[PDB]
Write a protein that binds this ligand. Sequence first.
Ligand SMILES: Cc1cc2nc3c(=O)[nH]c(=O)nc-3n(C[C@H](O)[C@H](O)[C@H](O)COP(=O)(O)OP(=O)(O)OC[C@H]3O[C@@H](n4cnc5c(N)ncnc54)[C@H](O)[C@@H]3O)c2cc1C=O
Ligand SMILES: Cc1cc2nc3c(=O)[nH]c(=O)nc-3n(C[C@H](O)[C@H](O)[C@H](O)COP(=O)(O)OP(=O)(O)OC[C@H]3O[C@@H](n4cnc5c(N)ncnc54)[C@H](O)[C@@H]3O)c2cc1C=O
Lengths: 577, 577
Amino acid sequence: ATDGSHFDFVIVGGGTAGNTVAGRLAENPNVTVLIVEAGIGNPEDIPEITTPSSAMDLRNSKYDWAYKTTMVRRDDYERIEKPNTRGKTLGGSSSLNYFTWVPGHKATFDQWEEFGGKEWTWDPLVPYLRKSATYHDDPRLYSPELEKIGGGGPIPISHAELIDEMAPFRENLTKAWKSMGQPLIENIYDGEMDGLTHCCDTIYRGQRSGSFLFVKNKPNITIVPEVHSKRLIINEADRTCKGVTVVTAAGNELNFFADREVILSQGVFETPKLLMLSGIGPTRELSRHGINTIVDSRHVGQNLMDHPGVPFVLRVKDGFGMDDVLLRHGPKRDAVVSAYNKNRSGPVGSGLLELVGFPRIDKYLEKDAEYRKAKAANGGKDPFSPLGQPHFELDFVCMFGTAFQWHFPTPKTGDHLTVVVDLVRPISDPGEVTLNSADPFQQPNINLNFFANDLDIIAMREGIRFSYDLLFKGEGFKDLVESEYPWEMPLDSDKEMHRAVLDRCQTAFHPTGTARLSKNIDQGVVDPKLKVHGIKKLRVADASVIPIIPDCRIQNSVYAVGEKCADMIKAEHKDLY
Amino acid sequence: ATDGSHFDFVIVGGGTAGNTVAGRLAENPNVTVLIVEAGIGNPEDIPEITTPSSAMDLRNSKYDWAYKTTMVRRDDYERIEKPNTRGKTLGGSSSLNYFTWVPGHKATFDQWEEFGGKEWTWDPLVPYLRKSATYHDDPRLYSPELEKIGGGGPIPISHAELIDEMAPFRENLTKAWKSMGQPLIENIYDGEMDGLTHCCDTIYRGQRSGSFLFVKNKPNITIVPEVHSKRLIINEADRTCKGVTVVTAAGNELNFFADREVILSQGVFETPKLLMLSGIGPTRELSRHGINTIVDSRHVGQNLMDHPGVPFVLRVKDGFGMDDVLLRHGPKRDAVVSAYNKNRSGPVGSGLLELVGFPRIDKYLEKDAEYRKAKAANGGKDPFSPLGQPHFELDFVCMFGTAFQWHFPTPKTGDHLTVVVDLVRPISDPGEVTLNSADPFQQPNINLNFFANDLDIIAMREGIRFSYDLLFKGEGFKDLVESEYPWEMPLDSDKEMHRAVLDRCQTAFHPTGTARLSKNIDQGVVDPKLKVHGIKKLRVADASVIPIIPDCRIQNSVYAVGEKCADMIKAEHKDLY
Ligand SMILES: Cc1cc2nc3c(=O)[nH]c(=O)nc-3n(C[C@H](O)[C@H](O)[C@H](O)COP(=O)(O)OP(=O)(O)OC[C@H]3O[C@@H](n4cnc5c(N)ncnc54)[C@H](O)[C@@H]3O)c2cc1C=O
Ligand SMILES: Cc1cc2nc3c(=O)[nH]c(=O)nc-3n(C[C@H](O)[C@H](O)[C@H](O)COP(=O)(O)OP(=O)(O)OC[C@H]3O[C@@H](n4cnc5c(N)ncnc54)[C@H](O)[C@@H]3O)c2cc1C=O
């Protein structure tokens, strides 16, 4: 693209919501759309991106921002980690994520009303939760009712394409789950999600479905990859966003201008950073780094909320995990790799997560004197999920997963199960994203503030206990477990579990909130139309907009945000739509 | 003590060097000495303090500052830890340390000349390295020449009082060491230290020898424990230190004044902090926290240097470690505990470290292409120890040691060996101590900057390899090893070892340098008489003074610093001494 070029719409950050907004705005072939993006422009050409079983290997790769971030910062404990993985590539984090497609609980989205008014509640959002996807059920295994989860969008989704060898595993896990007295559930798309379900995925015919699928073969979209944002171009007199400044690989600064609107989609971490570098954020924090304040927006970078996860690995009987096929070199791996290469069939095309659980654990919580007291102190309402929401998402990954074992080596032998214990309704206060300096090439500082509240530790402990009961005592599955890796979970000691949770937890990869939808600038950074409070012609569409984190893996809500954003922009520009 | 009281000398921080200086100045019964100290005043009354086998249990106890500190801060990796243990109690860190008494290499102390001139070199310092100690050899096991290591001081020291059951262990380790072609050595007190030695300790008749032994039964010493320093009292016009302000348990601020001199002994972390709070430090760093600059002293808090350590545990054959006697509850433990209680005999009185190795590893280093290139680039001189110094201190702790395994649980069964691989001559740049704020009750911020230079990683890797060779291949000992805890050291992969070293390393507990001796304020913070550049009547005596870290565990050099400081103060006040 030529320096100083004008486009109707500029999307800053070709990520998950970014491409969604861009592709929708481009549906009028006459509307000019520019996308600027730090990463490569041709993800579909990269096997590790398109191949679902390679996902975890994308951590630390060239497609990963690989941020340092503080996971917990309590007086008794603090840990900082790297990499806190985020996608750096067209498609953003939808190009390196773990595929699960799940919206969340109706009661939770209904509470968005406090921030976004009625249009940001469950029912009105349902269509936006479905618009991006085209649902498939080729093997005809699931209720035809479930076809309503795809509205016709360019992101192919399907229930996991089941691995044949894992059928015995699925059957035992199912038996175990029911033996605990917990429900099976298939429809988790209408606001209810209690039980063990067969998850859907952004995978189809063993290929990844990334947001880059929104923006190809559209000649009205100009895609400029490999450029790093320096600053939003803001006219102070007009209080207007004019466009964006970027730096090329050769180190040249380029300005691009939007004739209608700029949409900021740089994700939960970089969106608030670029706002601040552009003069929009907490005034004391700007001054501290030599940045003028154009709009004193206190909430920018604040309210960072994520799900803490404590994963744990069990060694399981031979043939009940995929380690020997996918993880280790050999003829077995060679075979499935050769099949995948010829027609994309086989387990190489698998995302390795097929059964997912959304339980409550009231009866475990009730056994803890402290939880009992906190609940009473809250007038008898459950602190975590007072509206019937799950307490956990339990992901049963059917092999050792490096992405969920940041400090333990990969075992050399044996098949494994990796259970991701994801606290989906935490009550710890949010963390924050702050500036390290005014340098656009430095990562912002990131504190997730996991487990600031002790109750969260107690719940996480109890969700590990629930998972252990299920797997060590559950019908069928109890016979599959061989050992705990890399040592025993100290479930016998509240004291030890306290240390175990803090020291072993990680991000579940769902950060949100840093430029949240709101009714005014004293509550959040963007209004219900996702316009930046205080600025004209500037909107944010990405996970930073999310005012209350969904009860599950969040990519579905992020696409929803992009779909709604595009709709709201179209409604505004009558002459174009 | 009464508010506003005057004393000839005020020691701020009743720690290792602190008490040394105080006790020596008090040798003229007419000189009044005050000691202020944050911790308790009666350590000799605390079993866990006086009992050498309890040392490791003092981590996280009430006697531990338990600082958060950043261990490594590289672009590819960063870890922050808690607790970074320091003594909070009369005697300071000499009240919770692991006893080893070893001075270091002559060539290294000779290089102090660049900072302190001739009087801070090996020969002149020898007497100061010996003054604090009274050497014992009751069982008459060692050369009578070695009695020269005790000059008659109030700190009883002895070669480790050997545990009988560990004799077979010592004998096998010795055989293994010699089988590798490395020397045995007993005299490591005259500047030479190449080999495996029987270490001496600040233990005698199974009681800890702490610096509090310097300051009891001296009625001219006023001891005020349980008070937290707020600030040094500095007269700007006179450029003079007048005394110190402290806060009591009840929250009252008290001023105490020195008629001759104030000696700051708050240790490597708190000494630079209090200087800064008092207006002495880097001016930009003071202003940033609202503190006036009285003296722009750039080096304050800078030059923090410590030894990185990568410990590792081996499970060893039954009866070749002390786990079953000291670590686990039972009749065995009951028996030795009952003996200790009646007459202080038995392994309960042991510091658990009896053999210590000081090897070079030139031939391991030479195998690494990068080391070879770096050495050539340094004109053919070894980067680490170009003057013949050791590369490592290898501590062979004869049981599982929690103090050296910060992220692994304590094994439930088996006897263990804990090998502390201490890189004693690192070449990474120093870290820093900075202010978090002007609040005297907040810990300063601490970055140790371990492994900033890749060569250090290569050496640490190779010192682990040397240790593994010794123990897995060495004569006698090879037959004792049962397994690696908690998994295998990835010695087969330079790549994995790189991650292993960074992720498993810790402080070896020897921080230094943050107010270093120097010839002028452009080089350091105190002059050769340990006077603070720019200020009269103010000296620093503690580990922050140390300009080049010794080649080993450092408590001996710290007492040396205190002994010299006291001598230099006495020489100045003729009318009193
Ligand atoms: C491991 C991983 C695994 C998970 N797994 C599951 C999953 O299983 N399913 C689930 O639903 N969610 C999961 N998630 C969340 C899910 O993947 C969602 O994608 C996120 O929750 C929300 O997607 P945004 O639209 O809010 O943010 P985005 O980062 O996508 O797009 C931002 C774009 O901007 C560019 N960009 C940024 N800065 C600059 C700059 N300075 N100059 C120029 N360009 C810049 C940057 O390169 C990128 O292209 C997962 C995420 C991670 C990993 O991040
Ligand atoms: C685990 C541990 C184990 C090791 N093991 C071996 C060992 O085996 N042998 C060895 O030679 N060295 C080892 N070392 C180092 C060795 O122990 C040495 O002691 C150190 O290397 C050097 O000793 P300072 O004189 O330089 O510093 P100090 O902290 O002693 O005294 C400071 C005093 O000031 C007080 N004080 C501080 N702040 C305030 C305040 N605000 N307001 C009021 N008071 C305040 C504070 O409470 C304390 O009393 C080891 C240390 C640690 C642990 O710290």
